[PDB]
C-alpha cells in the first residue's frame, strides 16, 4: 500500500551525478519517489554529496512516530514532498529551531518536522550523521558512499500535505482564537508566542493535531473532525511509460487534457482515454495515486481545506500555575 507512487527506489551509482530540474508533475513525483528531493535539499543546505533513499526510496523513509497512518498512502505528501512540488517550504534548521526529543536521530542524515510556523529540516554533510540526540552531526564512515539508505531520512509527524483552499485572515484569526481556547496552558510553541503567560516551563515535547492554513502559524487542534474527499483532480494522477518511467510535461499535459492516453478506471472516467489502436507507438498511461483524497478539517465550527494536516511532535512551553 505504501509502495512507490510511480518509480521503484533508485539505485544511484555516482554520488556526484547532477539532480536535474524536471518540469513534469509525474517527473517530480518520481524524484519524490526516489527521495531525490531530500537528496537535493541536503546538497543545497548541508554540504551533502550524493543521495539518500538509495534502494528504498520514499517508501522506506523513517518516521516519528513509527506507527504512521499517512505513510501507508504513498500518494499522501509529506512536507518534503510538498516542498519539491512548490506547495510549501521546508527550511534549513538554524540555532533557534528545537530538535524535539523522541525520534531515533542516531545516524540520521536528514530529519524534518513541522513547526508551529513552518517546516524545518536538519541536514548532515558528506560522511556525517546525527548523534542519538540529533543535536550534532558527527563523523559516520557508514555514510561515506554518499548513497544512503532511506532510513537515514526521518520525517517527523503523521503529516499530510495538499493544495489548500485559502481562507481570509479574519477566519484564521478566529481559528487561532479557538486554538488558544483549546490550549490555554500552552504559551510558546516552537519559540512562537501562542498564549500570553508571564511564566512558562522549559519547552516540552508537544504532540498535537494541527493544520497549516497558510497564515503566520499553524492552528493546533484538540477536538476536530476530518473528512477525506476524493477529488480526482489532475494532481491525483500520474502518467508513466510502464518501464520508461514518468512522461514529459508535454506528454503528461496531453494525457490530462486530450484524453488520448491510457488510464485506469478513475482516469478514463474523469479525463477520457483511448484503449486500442494506440496512435503513438509509445503512449503514456495515467493512474490514480494511492491516497484517501484531500482532507477537509472541521474545527471551531468551521470547515477548512488546509495546506497540511498533521499530528506531530512540536516544542511547547507550559504555563506556570
Amino acid at each position, epitope marked *: 500500500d505504501s509502495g512507490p507512487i510511480i518509480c521503484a527506489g533508485p539505485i544511484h551509482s555516482n554520488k556526484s551525478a547532477d539532480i536535474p530540474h524536471l518540469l513534469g508533475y509525474s517527473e517530480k513525483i518520481c524524484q519524490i519517489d526516489r527521495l531525490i528531493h531530500v537528496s537535493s535539499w541536503l546538497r*543545497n*543546505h*548541508s*554540504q551533502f554529496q550524493g543521495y539518500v533513499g538509495q534502494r528504498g526510496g520514499r517508501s522506506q523513509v523513517s518516521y516519528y512516530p513509527a506507527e504512521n497512518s499517512y505513510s501507508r498512502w504513498s500518494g499522501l505528501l509529506s512536507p518534503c514532498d510538498a516542498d519539491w512540488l512548490g506547495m510549501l*517550504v521546508v*527550511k*534549513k534548521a*538554524k*540555532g*533557534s529551531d528545537m530538535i524535539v526529543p523522541g525520534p531515533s536521530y542516531k545516524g540520521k542524515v536528514f530529519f524534518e518536522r513541522p513547526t508551529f510556523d513552518g517546516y524545518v529540516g536538519w541536514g548532515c*554533510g558528506s560522511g*556525517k550523521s546525527r548523534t542519538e540526540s540529533g543535536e*550534532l*552531526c558527527s563523523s559516520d564512515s557508514g555514510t561515506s558512499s554518499g548513497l544512503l539508505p532511506s532510513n537515514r531520512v526521518l520525517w517527523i509527524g503523521d503529516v499530510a500535505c495538499q493544495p489548500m483552499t485559502p481562507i481570509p485572515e479574519e477566519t484564521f484569526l478566529e481559528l487561532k482564537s479557538f486554538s488558544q481556547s483549546e490550549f490555554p496552558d500552552i504559551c510558546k510553541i516552537d519559540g512562537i508566542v501562542f498564549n500570553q503567560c508571564e511564566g512558562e516551563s522549559l519547552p516540552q515535547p508537544f504532540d498535537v493535531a494541527w493544520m497549516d492554513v497558510g497564515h*503566520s502559524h499553524k492552528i493546533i487542534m484538540r477536538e476536530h473532525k476530518t473528512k477525506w474527499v476524493q477529488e480526482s483532480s489532475s494532481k491525483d494522477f500520474v502518467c508513466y511509460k510502464e518501464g520508461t518511467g514518468p512522461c514529459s510535461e508535454s506528454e503528461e499535459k496531453t494525457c490530462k487534457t486530450s484524453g488520448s492516453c491510457r488510464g485506469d478506471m478513475q482516469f478514463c472516467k474523469v479525463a477520457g482515454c483511448e484503449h486500442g489502436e494506440e496512435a503513438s507507438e509509445a503512449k503514456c498511461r495515467c493512474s490514480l495515486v494511492h491516497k484517501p483524497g484531500e482532507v477537509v478539517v472541521s474545527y471551531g465550527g468551521m470547515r477548512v481545506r488546509p495546506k497540511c494536516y498533521g499530528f506531530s511532535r512540536m516544542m511547547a512551553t507550559l504555563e506556570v500555575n
Partner: antibody
Amino acid sequence: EVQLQQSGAELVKPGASVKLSCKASGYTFTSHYMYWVKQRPGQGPEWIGEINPTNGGTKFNEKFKSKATLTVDKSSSTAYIQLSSLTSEDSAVYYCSSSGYDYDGRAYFDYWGQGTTLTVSS
Amino acid sequence: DVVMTQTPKFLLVSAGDRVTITCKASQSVSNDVAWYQQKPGQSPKLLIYYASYRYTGVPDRFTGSGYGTDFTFTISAVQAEDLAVYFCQQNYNSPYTFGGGTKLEIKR
C-alpha cells in the same frame, strides 16, 4: 531587479536621533529578514539586529538594543533604523542587507544596501 | 554572543600564493557561516555561504570549508584584485556575529 536602496548620507548633532531607511525592491520584501550592520571607518562590521518584515519582530545585538529601533513598512518595502542618543561613536556606515536562502528561487542570496553614512557632529 | 575568532588578522602574500583564513566559532554553528570579501568603499560581498558553497558568480579560487566550529576560507591563488578585508559571519544563531576580519595585502 534586486536592490536595497539606502537613504542618503546623514549628519546629525550629538544627542539627536536619525532615521535611516532601506527600500527593498526586486524581491518579495516579506520573505527575507532585514539586517542592519554598522561599520566604523576601517573597522570590521557590527551586526546591529534583524527585523522580520512579516512581524516587525526583531533580534538585536545587545550592544544596540537601546541605540537602534528597527521597524519595517510592508506597504513600501522599507526597513527603517532609528538611531537615538547619538554620540560620535555612532558615526559609521550603516548597511541594510538581506541574506539567507531564497526558498523561492532555491538559491542563496546576499543583498546589501549601498551603505548610508552617518556623521555625528555639531 | 557566539564569538567568531578569525585568524590571521593580516596576510601578506604574493599574487599566486594560497591564502587560508581560519575562523573558530566559540560554539557549534553548523555550516551556517558566510565568508565576505570587503574592498574599500564597497559594501561586503558574499563569497562563501553555508561554510563551503561559493556564492553565485564567485571565482573558483575562493573556497570555504568547515562545519561545527572550525571554518577555513581559502583563496587557492591570490590575485591582485583580491585586496580586501575578509571575514566569516556566523548566521546560525542570533545575534549573528562577525569574525574580526583579515586584511589581505599583496607582497610585491
